[model samples]
Target: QTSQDLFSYQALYSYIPQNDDELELRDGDIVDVMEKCDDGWFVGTSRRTKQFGTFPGNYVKPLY
Candidate 1:
């Protein structure tokens, strides 16, 4: 809730990966969103996992 707003996303729902590239998400997890895809997916590294991967865009909302 500080200056981190410039590059983060707040998880809207918990997500379980169904594929290798998908990043697992827990509700309220704050992640660093790297790239956004037109196919409704996004690339980010989760603070909870410290892992980089793709995740559903709808699972989170931009901090800004």
Candidate 2:
């Protein structure tokens, strides 16, 4: 069976429809959202691969 067939529909569904506002620290920069991935992994360009941490409130701007 293919990987798609091996994985259940529910499993794939669980990864879909995620909150777009999810934030991340990429390449030492704060990103407001993560780019979508075909394999169900939310991937994006990181500001610094070695350093991992959430963006501080000071770095984040107001939505409005």
Candidate 3:
């Protein structure tokens, strides 16, 4: 058995840094989903880094 409490996400498209918190993500990179937003974007953190940003919900797939 395995125990994990981390949420995950995969980027659907390549991303470029355009904000103070947005982190670059390669296609299919796993992300740490943080919060859901009502403006079509969600607050997330990078798995490899602690950087936080707002990204399109449609650009990622939620995973356990």
Candidate 4:
């Protein structure tokens, strides 16, 4: 089976981008916003490697 078969789009959307500024999830940036069960906290994921990382809010700004 292919990797696509294992993960579905529905499963991905389960994690939505809550705080937009914190993660800097702009149209160009390839990232995913997900929630962590351990602390019920939200996190960011890199689209290229599917790796998780910390995104402290207040560092981003709107383009226009």
Candidate No. with top TM-score: 1
Query: Residue 27: error of model 4 in Å?
Result: 11
- Higher-lDDT candidate among 2 and 4? 4
Clashing pairs in 2: 26-46, 26-47, 27-46, 27-47, 27-48, 28-47, 28-48
Off by over 4 Å in 1: 1-6
Candidate 3 lDDT tens digits, 1-64: 2996656787776688798767677777777767777887777776656677767767888753
User: What lDDT is obtained when candidate 2 is compared to the true structure?
Assistant: 0.30
Better of 2 and 3 by TM-score: 3
Clashes in candidate 4: how many? 1
Global CA lDDT computed for model 4:
0.38
lDDT of each: 0.79, 0.30, 0.73, 0.38
Evaluated at residue 53, the lDDT of candidate 2 is 30
lDDT tens per residue, model 2, 1-64? 4553111011111111134533334223423323334544433323334332322333333332
Each candidate's TM vs. the true structure?
Answer: 0.73, 0.18, 0.66, 0.31
Residue 37 miss distance in model 4 (angstroms): 11
Best by lDDT: 1
Selected candidate, larger lDDT, 3 vs 4: 3
The per-residue C-alpha lDDT of model 3 at residue 50 equals: 64
lDDT rank, highest first? Answer: 1, 3, 4, 2
Q: Where does candidate 2 have its weakest 10-residue lDDT segment? A: 6-15
Worst 10 residues of 4 by lDDT: 5-14
